[PDB]
Write a protein that binds this DNA or RNA. Structure first.
Ligand SMILES: [Mg+2]
Ligand SMILES: [Mg+2]
Ligand SMILES: [Mg+2]
Ligand SMILES: [Mg+2]
Ligand SMILES: [Mg+2]
Ligand SMILES: [Mg+2]
Ligand SMILES: [Mg+2]
Ligand SMILES: [Mg+2]
Ligand SMILES: [Mg+2]
Ligand SMILES: [Mg+2]
Ligand SMILES: [Mg+2]
Ligand SMILES: [Zn+2]
Lengths: 190, 170, 63, 52, 107
RNA sequence: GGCCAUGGAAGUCGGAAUCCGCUAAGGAGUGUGUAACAACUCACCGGCCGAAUGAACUAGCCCUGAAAAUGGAUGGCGCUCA
């Protein structure tokens, strides 16, 4: 239908300074700065005030309009990453074989080392992405805390850890072993 | 490229009926040869008359009343598809009744593969009230204080080669 | 077949049941629940002779 | 043995799914169409069967 | 068609009970069970009627009919949120004895 | 904890039933969970925001349907607001 114009309104909290130039968004907050390039999308930005930003698509078709609220949501996630942080909690699920999880450092790189998963002699290593913090929960047995400013990196490292623990050649309805994301929240509780 | 015509015809007078009723149709045709042809096409869809037994009385061009006034038109259609016969209603923005019908013919060719031969124009009405506009693709141009840019302008060059980097500002 | 003029007694012996409107609503609760058994309820099944006095058949406005 | 709290967390990823009837795809339970192009985004779905 | 008839019966029984008794005060609840509500009306057979329903229908179906029973008018801005009605007329103390009686609490 | 089946089945094994009463709200119950209940979840009604929403159908382009043997043919190159 080629909608003539479609708009979304970003909301900037008091301590956050978004900064946009040539579709390169740099969001600054109390917790730090995050940057993202959006050169793969045709959008335009207008600063309504210091607390609001208009995001506009002119004469956009259905898919190109669909790509507008995703831009809004990504920048909002950047804003809440530098003002609240992100925290994913993972629970270790096993029926028989305890999962031995350590945070090791090899070749100057941080890794998550999973051992004895379903009794295997194999040692699983997951690279920890930059800007992502791992911690073994003390308050909970068999719990890993993945935290950081960027939601994308945190959720993708968590997914890496979950995916490396997939069960093969078994009835996965019965063999429910693995490492699963149990809680998706923020560093600053709300 | 079309014109709107007023075509008036009648059955040939007989000693039984020496003044048959005069029937008029508004025909959108490229020229007067097709206008009188289209007239007989529709009379034989409605009345017991033929070209051999009838007579064309008058053919006149109907010019737009306000050709520099922007209007919204609603057009009622009856077209044939590959499978059946369908009624449809669509809306067009233009300054002349003829230019809306030309847009209509381009529009049904593109989205429904309906050729000129497959379309009957039931009615063309200028929508006076903003509440009369039913379709969103023309209603979006009736909003207050409408502004929009034209991003990514492509300039047509007379030369094959240009010595400076291309731009698309506008 | 009952009432045997005692279906109110079953309502007033089970007086602690249906928190209805005015006592006769309790009788309907036994009316509705006993239909799930299916016996000689005045000849047929309930949800019928119930629905007679539900709209208003003979007379049970007992006080 | 897995505690019931953890068995529901695991079942969210292993069991709570819908399956495409023509090409065998693991789909979200609420999905109305299959996401795979090979089957034509069919609406012929059915829940993933459970142990019994 | 059924909803507009059940809407009509609702406004019918709303104005039937409005003139039959009188004067009502604030009557709001939350986290109240269905058996919780059956307890109050079990003892409040005839002395009070538990008028129930919702919000948006109650406000406009009375606000437009502020002609045969005006008086209220500015009384409508009171109706906010989960609010029922206990149609009665007694005294500021004689109703809270029979109504506030049952309480269900939680940590 | 409806009736009967049932070792037990109380809504969530299985059969006649599918009602009533309070309700604005609620099925003799849509699921997970129990040996069984319990438990929570839903069906429907509430509060909240407030301007649109759901269903069936028609036919255009595209996709699935669409498997053969030398390497290879919208004539070739190549072409995607063509
Ligand atoms: Mg096997
Ligand atoms: Mg005829
Ligand atoms: Mg158009
Ligand atoms: Mg045009
Ligand atoms: Mg067009
Ligand atoms: Mg034809
Ligand atoms: Mg040039
Ligand atoms: Mg289609
Ligand atoms: Mg497809
Ligand atoms: Mg094809
Ligand atoms: Mg061209
Ligand atoms: Zn599929």
């Amino acid at each position: 239908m080629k909608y003539i114009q479609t708009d979304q309104i970003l909301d900037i909290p008091e301590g956050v300074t978004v900064d946009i130039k040539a579709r390169v968004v740099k969001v600054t907050g109390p917790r730090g700065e995050l940057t993202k390039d959006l050169k793969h999308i045709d959008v335009t930005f207008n600063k309504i005030n210091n607390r609001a930003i208009k995001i506009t698509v002119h004469n956009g078709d259905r898919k190109h309009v669909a790509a507008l609220r995703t831009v809004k949501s990504l920048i909002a996630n950047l804003i809440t990453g530098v003002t609240k942080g992100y925290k994913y909690k993972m629970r270790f699920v096993y029926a028989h074989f305890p999962i031995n999880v350590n945070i090791i450092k090899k070749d100057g790189q941080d890794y998550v080392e999973i051992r004895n998963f379903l009794g295997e002699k194999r040692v699983r290593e997951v690279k920890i992405h930059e800007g992502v913090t791992m911690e073994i929960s003390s308050t909970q047995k068999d719990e890993l805390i993945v935290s950081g400013n960027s939601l994308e990196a945190v959720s993708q490292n968590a997914a890496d850890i979950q995916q490396i623990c997939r069960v093969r050649n078994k009835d996965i309805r019965k063999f429910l072993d693995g490492i699963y994301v149990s809680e998706r929240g923020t560093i600053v509780e709300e | 490229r079309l014109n709107e015509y007023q075509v008036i015809g009648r059955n040939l007078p007989t000693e039984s009926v020496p003044e048959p009723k005069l029937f008029r149709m508004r025909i959108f045709a490229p020229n007067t040869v097709v206008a009188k042809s289209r007239y007989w096409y529709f009379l034989q869809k409605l009345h017991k008359v033929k070209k051999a037994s009838g007579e064309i009385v008058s053919v006149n061009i109907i010019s737009e009343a306000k050709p520099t006034k922007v209007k919204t038109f609603g057009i009622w259609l009856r077209y044939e598809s590959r499978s059946g016969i369908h009624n449809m209603y669509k809306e067009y923005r233009d300054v002349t009744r003829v230019g809306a019908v030309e847009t209509m013919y381009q529009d049904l060719a593109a989205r429904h593969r309906a050729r000129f031969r497959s379309i009957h124009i039931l009615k063309v009405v200028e929508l006076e009230k903003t509440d009369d506009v039913k379709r969103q693709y023309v209603k979006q141009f009736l909003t207050k204080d409408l502004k929009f840019p034209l991003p990514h302008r492509v300039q047509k060059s007379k030369k094959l080669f240009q010595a400076t980097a291309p731009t698309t500002f506008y | 077949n009952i009432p045997l003029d005692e279906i109110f007694e079953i309502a007033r012996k089970m007086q602690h049941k249906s928190f209805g409107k005015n006592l006769a609503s309790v009788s309907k609760e036994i009316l509705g629940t006993a239909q799930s058994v299916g016996c000689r309820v005045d000849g047929k099944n309930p949800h019928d002779i119930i629905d007679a006095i539900n709209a208003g058949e003979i007379d049970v406005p007992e006080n | 043995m897995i505690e019931p709290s953890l068995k529901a967390l695991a079942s969210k990823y292993n069991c709570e799914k819908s399956i495409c009837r023509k090409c065998y795809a693991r789909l979200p339970p609420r999905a109305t169409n299959c996401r795979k192009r090979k089957c034509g985004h069919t609406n012929q779905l059915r829940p993933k069967k459970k142990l019994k | 068609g059924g909803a507009r008839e059940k809407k009509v019966q609702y406004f019918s029984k709303l104005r039937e009970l409005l003139e039959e008794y009188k004067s009502i005060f604030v009557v709001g609840v939350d986290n109240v069970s269905s058996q919780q509500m059956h307890e109050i009306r079990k003892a409040l057979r005839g002395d009070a009627v538990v008028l129930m329903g919702k919000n948006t229908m109650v406000r406009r179906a009375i606000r437009g009919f502020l002609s045969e029973l005006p008086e209220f008018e500015k009384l409508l801005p009171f109706i906010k949120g989960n609010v029922g009605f206990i149609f009665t007329n007694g005294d500021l103390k004689s109703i809270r004895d029979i109504v506030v009686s049952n309480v269900v609490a939680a940590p």
